[PDB]
Amino acid sequence: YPVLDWNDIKFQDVIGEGGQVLKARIKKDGLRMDAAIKRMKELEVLCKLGHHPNIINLLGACEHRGYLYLAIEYAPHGNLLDFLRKSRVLETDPAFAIANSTASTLSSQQLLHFAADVARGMDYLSQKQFIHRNLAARNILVGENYVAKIADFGLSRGQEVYVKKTGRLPVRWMAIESLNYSVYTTNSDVWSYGVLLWEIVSLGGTPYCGMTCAELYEKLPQGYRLEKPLNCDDEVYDLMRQCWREKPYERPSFAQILVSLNRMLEERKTYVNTTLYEKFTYAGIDCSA
Numbered sequence: 001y002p003v004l005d006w007n008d009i010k011f012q013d014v015i016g017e018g019g020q021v022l023k024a025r026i027k028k029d030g031l032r033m034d035a036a037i038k039r040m041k042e043l044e045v046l047c048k049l050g051h052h053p054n055i056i057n058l059l060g061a062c063e064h065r066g067y068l069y070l071a072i073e074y075a076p077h078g079n080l081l082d083f084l085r086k087s088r089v090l091e092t093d094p095a096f097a098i099a100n101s102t103a104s105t106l107s108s109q110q111l112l113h114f115a116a117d118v119a120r121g122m123d124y125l126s127q128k129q130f131i132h133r134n135l136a137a138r139n140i141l142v143g144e145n146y147v148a149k150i151a152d153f154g155l156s157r158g159q160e161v162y163v164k165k166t167g168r169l170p171v172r173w174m175a176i177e178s179l180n181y182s183v184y185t186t187n188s189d190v191w192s193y194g195v196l197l198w199e200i201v202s203l204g205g206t207p208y209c210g211m212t213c214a215e216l217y218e219k220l221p222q223g224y225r226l227e228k229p230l231n232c233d234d235e236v237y238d239l240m241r242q243c244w245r246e247k248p249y250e251r252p253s254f255a256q257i258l259v260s261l262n263r264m265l266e267e268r269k270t271y272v273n274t275t276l277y278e279k280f281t282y283a284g285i286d287c288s289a
């Protein structure tokens with residue numbers, strides 16, 4: 001749904017590392033478009049769903065010499081985290097940075113729309129009972145027209161899902177119940193989303209720069225939260241803080257989040273500063289992460 005003919009695929013380049021994925025061009029319903037194709041060895045109807053503008057759409061699937069190749073909507077601009085980081089103009093093009101009084105090629109409004117974008121997608125998923133379990137900047141793709149898209153693959157669907165650990169955990173993104181007990185819910189997804197939001201605001205900062213994974217475990221039950229960024233308005237931070245409430249059911253819903261962003265967007269006020277003025281400080285990326 002649909003079905004792709006092999007003879008319409010023209011592969012262009014490989015993308016990433018390892019599973020095994022490629023950039024193609026497919027023909028679908030008489031139109032030519034970029035796809036990303038992954039080839040699996042040896043669930044798809046629910047994969048649309050993708051019909052939503054912030055969810056990587058499924059384009060086609062196609063059996064060829066014993067394999068199933070899966071074509072999905074192609075994202076021109078990488079994961080959101082890199083995109084954001086490459087936007088750090090003081091570091092990548094300071095002549096530009098100074099001339100234009102700016103710390104990013106991205107604007108506060110644009111930064112928020114990525115937030116809204118993901119917020120919106122999640123809202124639509126969470127209300128169809130899906131649990132992402134991996135919300136993080138690096139896990140969001142920036143798609144055509146710079147519209148942020150979520151990945152719908154391997155999504156647990158249900159009220160709650162327990163997964164046993166053992167690979168690496170996104171500790172810095174996880175909420176406490178997930179930390180304590182390896183359980184994920186939609187409410188666990190919102191916690192992660194606030195870290196995503198925090199990530200966006202820090203133009204790609206590593207959350208909890210300096211702290212180690214051990215330190216976090218001990219300090220989070222303690223009531224410790226990520227520090228409000230120097231470029232961030234108080235309400236934006238406030239919103240992050242709600243996502244990180246200790247009591248899961250206390251946190252907001254994506255609708256609530258989304259409502260609140262949409263308000264912020266409609267105001268003329270800058271909620272996320274990217275303008276140099278007299279001082280500006282990029283959240284650390286390095287650290288021992």
Ligand SMILES: Nc1ncnc2sc(-c3c(-c4ccccc4)ncn3CC3CCCCC3)nc12
Binds near residue numbers: 074
């Ligand atoms: N649509 C795309 N356009 C650009 N590049 C890529 S890389 C990619 C991908 C796939 C994949 C899965 C199915 C088909 C094709 C690719 N499996 C892991 N990834 C990498 C992950 C990156 C972070 C967010 C989750 C996906 N999909 C895209």
